[PDB]
Design a binder for this molecule. Structure first.
Ligand SMILES: Nc1ncnc2c1ncn2[C@@H]1O[C@H](COP(=O)(O)O)[C@@H](O)[C@H]1O
Ligand SMILES: Nc1ncnc2c1ncn2[C@@H]1O[C@H](COP(=O)(O)O)[C@@H](O)[C@H]1O
Ligand SMILES: Nc1ncnc2c1ncn2[C@@H]1O[C@H](COP(=O)(O)O)[C@@H](O)[C@H]1O
Ligand SMILES: Nc1ncnc2c1ncn2[C@@H]1O[C@H](COP(=O)(O)O)[C@@H](O)[C@H]1O
Ligand SMILES: O=P(O)(O)OC[C@@H]1O[C@H](COP(=O)(O)O)[C@@H](O)[C@@H]1O
Ligand SMILES: O=P(O)(O)OC[C@@H]1O[C@H](COP(=O)(O)O)[C@@H](O)[C@@H]1O
Ligand SMILES: O=P(O)(O)OC[C@@H]1O[C@H](COP(=O)(O)O)[C@@H](O)[C@@H]1O
Ligand SMILES: O=P(O)(O)OC[C@@H]1O[C@H](COP(=O)(O)O)[C@@H](O)[C@@H]1O
Ligand SMILES: [K+]
Ligand SMILES: [K+]
Ligand SMILES: [K+]
Ligand SMILES: [K+]
Ligand SMILES: [K+]
Ligand SMILES: [K+]
Ligand SMILES: [K+]
Ligand SMILES: [K+]
Ligand SMILES: [K+]
Ligand SMILES: [K+]
Ligand SMILES: [K+]
Ligand SMILES: [K+]
Lengths: 317, 317, 317, 317
């Protein structure tokens, strides 16, 4: 007995008495992710080096085309695209998909772990599809998750029912359910943040970090980790517990991370896992988007760690 | 045209006029690296999950076995083995290999980049091979390098004539020379260190760090990055420039990283690349080891960055 | 735009307003076939040769376990199994699957193309499942097809709607629809038969062959081809046209090929393609099985070629 | 222990005391074979089918390019090229390679086993390399063998010291020595020939064939097998014993198969394996060619079987 992503999705679609439109969608995503994974591990690079005689772009095209061919979407929002992609009426479905085809594109040259981030909305309204359909608060997410191309490829899927992790067996090109109904640690022992912006941190953030290195109660300090790729940092948080942070500073007073295809999908995954995702002031998933490429500060991870910072945030209020 | 590791290695062996003994060794190493990469990528995991019909220990076995069969080694030092392995008189060769089969094994469950580290010495004290033969300063390295199992697999090889990077094309199981004679930037813009040990840093490290976040002349501060995997962090340093640091602290008064199979190979690669690798007080490669599992502090990266920290070390003494 | 087997099956299940039970079944088969394909191409053979320190049996276990885990079957008939496999009431579905996990097992050692043959029946009755449920004439087939592990892996699926061919892209482990609604040639130019049994052929067969080598109308003779693996021979017939034959002789007066999991699936595929499948006397698909391992003579291929022999058969009646 | 082609080849080069020039050649060949196997298995075909973002010509380019870069060849003869290719003075070596990049190209669309055939001569007439250098009897072969892309990929290598079979482990892209010093059965029980040419067979062939179906002393008749792919049929002959025949006929008065890149390599492999390879009148390897694309009749296989046919040839003369 072994559970594959294809089996899992189908059984979940069956229990939910769906028309099978969303299952077609999730199966198309699974395929896109396997295609991207293969391109990322450099299969066929020899030909590029003349054996017989861009990566973010290839990833964008793969997701966009595999998604359109699902006949289950009406609007697509990509980080690589200025405007939202409205699906041809021939292949038009009822879902809105926001995604980041290849996050951590800067890390590509250094071979650091990268990934794909996606969020699925059910179109709410009854008129010609437009960018306005993507502009829904993260709380309205039908499904969300990510694919991490690290030492191994893994797809983390989060739905109303919970969070489940699927490992890619590259030998047979099938995702195996290796961890079901994942719940995050209450309190971790690692903080993640680009301390190279110390000079720009607000007093609350500055205080929290200081508390981590120099525990006032003289407990053991927190270990530091900052890969540089959100999917890698956040996935480690989900699995090992702790706190990831990318608050505002000179690098945009609105933070760097995007709301629709980065913050929301990860916040959704986090909350479903039993953790928190805040901007320091409000819950990320309750923000009403104003633009499809709207940025937003984010602090996420173990509940007890995120709450501790939230208090320090209140102190300086 | 297309250059494969196999062709490159043989070609170099010929120019060098070797008896082809080292070529056999480097060829065996290459084979061990492709076997580990495959295991790491989780190929065939569906079989563990009951489709019907460890990773560090497996990596250890692969490297040991594949090396012994090369008939080119006499002494082997693994991080996984308390004692140095002495090869059978039947399979003995003139080379001593010091390696770390799978480095960053804590990051495995989190799916973060990991790797293999190797250092090759030539047994000169023609006596019965013993542990003593591995106890040579890194200055005596014949060849050294590493394999990074990140988003893609790469093998960095360093020898007297330079450093060369080989990307693995998993389709055909061939390493392609993607970068020739690699040389690191004089000055970088990223510092790498576990700041969670701030409470235990010596005044030199403490001053340098704060100088990176708050630059005297108001210039751009350095970005921070700390994957938690030496091979990953050092490769980023090599490719993008900057400085990696794992100084001595209370928990590790002599540092955490090992001299023979971690510090030395990376120090050797750094020097051949045109960078510096120091203990803070002296060059890593000149240290004459006393224990095969001897630890050593390490600071490496761009020359200009490493020098700056070395001056601060001189200032506080 | 590209069609995958997973997409195809789902859309076909949707048009047919199924409960999704048979789709779960076809998806489980797709997975089993990819697993077998990988084992056949020898991935991981190095470990068997001690790098770090039966095939028909593995194939049987894979299909049996992957099928049971579909929760869509009640009875399974395998060539490798003396008795039919009755599914545990926990995983019991409504379908009966007859199959040959690895046909041409004798050819394995010679590396000749081999394959998998399957036929799907819908249980007809309302009582405890038993072998009796498998004993239905081939005309009652819901679906049938085969997987050919040759120069490339291909799955041919035949249903009431038609015959469609899917090519396995081993890089992403996905079956691509490369040929839809396949129809066989009216008249081919190749005959396939083990002429090493000439001494045992009945006069009709003997006459046909003679007509092929020495055309009475002085037309061009037929080329000969006999791979030795039914799936390979039959697939070539389906694609290039011609006639495949395995009539009775001293090698059992009932022929060698099995009715349920070899003759029927291939006859079904053939008829759906626009060809014929006969025992010389009757249509293969109309035979009422008496035993699950019942053998049956078979002549299949292009209509005009099969009819020509049928006449010669009548002449000698 | 585990023996890889790479290790085996180098080891043999060392014992032979070669300048490592031929080793480079055999290493390049090996690389070309893994590239062809991958293309043949249809890896990445999903990209032709619009997932968004020949085979014989491609195989030709791969072999030519990978061989030229080995800096070990001066003259190349391909079935795909009318004229012999003369390597640039810059990349020239002392070896002449005669090859058939992808044999059985008619069987491609039918997915039947196909392969690569190669013969290696040493240029002895030290003059400007020309077509003349390839015109040497197969008796002058330094090395010969083939790659079979069947159910699994295998590389058969034959040299003065014997014939060795290497199985490809596609996971790690390594050829493993699965069979050492291969030697064919004295007598087989399978005859291989296209009997569709019965109307044009000489009385010797005709008598031998009928003697196989109707044995004088009532013994068991021979089984028939004719894949239609030389490499596949010859490999079956090598592994299981028997006789392969492609005699001269009206359509091919001098046979169909080429001397330099088909007959010779297989004849060489046969002789080293302990079998016989005849034209019916003389040994294939002793023929001094006049044309690079010269055809030649061929009969090969177990010694006892080939001898029997040779006696019948003597009887009718
Ligand atoms: N694979 C599935 N897994 C879980 N829920 C699903 C699945 N498919 C559909 N649903 C649900 O049923 C609703 C409508 O599905 P659908 O008819 O396919 O568009 C969805 O939005 C979810 O509530
Ligand atoms: N592949 C090679 N590349 C560069 N130098 C080599 C190679 N093989 C051997 N050498 C060198 O020649 C010395 C002796 O080689 P060997 O005779 O193979 O043990 C080595 O220790 C290096 O100095
Ligand atoms: N994937 C499918 N493709 C074509 N027909 C299907 C599919 N699934 C179910 N059917 C059909 O609908 C009947 C009952 O399906 P089911 O409810 O899934 O057992 C089948 O036996 C076929 O007639
Ligand atoms: N890998 C090898 N295995 C067996 N014999 C070899 C090998 N390499 C070279 N030789 C032989 O030594 C001769 C000259 O080799 P080379 O100096 O490499 O051109 C060859 O033509 C063969 O006789
Ligand atoms: O994909 P991008 O545009 O290159 O950025 C990725 C994001 O960039 C963040 C790190 O940025 P800093 O270097 O400012 O810390 C990560 O958390 C995210 O992956
Ligand atoms: O393989 P190990 O024993 O788990 O250690 C890996 C090393 O551990 C260092 C980080 O350890 P800290 O958490 O102490 O910083 C990295 O630089 C190296 O990769
Ligand atoms: O799988 P098996 O039991 O080894 O047999 C395979 C079948 O065996 C037939 C050939 O048998 P002959 O050698 O008698 O021709 C093929 O047509 C079929 O693939
Ligand atoms: O590559 P080609 O030109 O298509 O020919 C392949 C050869 O053709 C022979 C069979 O041809 P016939 O159909 O004439 O028997 C086989 O033995 C060889 O593989
Ligand atoms: K991006
Ligand atoms: K991004
Ligand atoms: K971003
Ligand atoms: K380790
Ligand atoms: K380590
Ligand atoms: K260590
Ligand atoms: K079988
Ligand atoms: K069989
Ligand atoms: K059978
Ligand atoms: K050809
Ligand atoms: K040919
Ligand atoms: K030919």
């Amino acid at each position: 007995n072994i559970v594959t992503l294809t089996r899992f999705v189908m059984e979940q679609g069956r229990k939910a008495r769906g028309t099978g439109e969303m299952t077609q969608l999730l199966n198309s995503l699974c395929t896109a992710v396997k295609a991207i994974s293969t391109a990322v591990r450099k299969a066929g690079i020899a030909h590029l080096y003349g054996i017989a005689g861009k990566l973010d772009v290839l990833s964008n095209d793969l997701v966009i085309n595999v998604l359109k061919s699902s006949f289950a979407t009406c609007v697509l929002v990509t980080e690589e695209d200025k405007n939202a992609i409205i699906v041809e009426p021939e292949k038009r479905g009822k879902y809105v998909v926001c995604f980041d085809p290849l996050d951590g594109s800067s890390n590509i040259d250094c071979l650091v772990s990268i990934g794909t981030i996606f969020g699925i909305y059910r179109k709410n309204s009854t008129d010609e599809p437009s960018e306005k359909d993507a502009l829904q608060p993260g709380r309205n997410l039908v499904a969300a998750g990510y694919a991490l191309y690290g030492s191994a490829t893994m797809l983390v899927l989060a739905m109303v029912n919970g969070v489940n992790c699927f490992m890619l067996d590259p030998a047979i090109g099938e995702f195996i359910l290796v961890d079901r109904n994942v719940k995050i640690k209450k309190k971790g022992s690692i903080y993640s943040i680009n301390e190279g912006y110390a000079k720009e941190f607000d007093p609350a953030i500055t205080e929290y970090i200081q508390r981590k290195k120099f525990p006032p109660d003289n407990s053991a300090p927190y270990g530091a980790r900052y890969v540089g790729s959100m999917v890698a940092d956040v996935h480690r948080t989900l699995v090992y517990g702790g706190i990831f942070m990318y608050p505002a500073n000179k690098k945009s007073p609105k933070g760097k991370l995007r709301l629709l295809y980065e913050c929301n999908p990860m916040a959704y995954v986090m909350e479903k896992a039993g953790g928190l995702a805040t901007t320091g002031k409000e819950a990320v998933l309750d923000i009403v988007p104003t633009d499809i490429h709207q940025r937003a500060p984010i602090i996420l991870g173990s509940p007890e760690d995120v709450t501790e910072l939230l208090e320090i945030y209140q102190k300086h209020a």
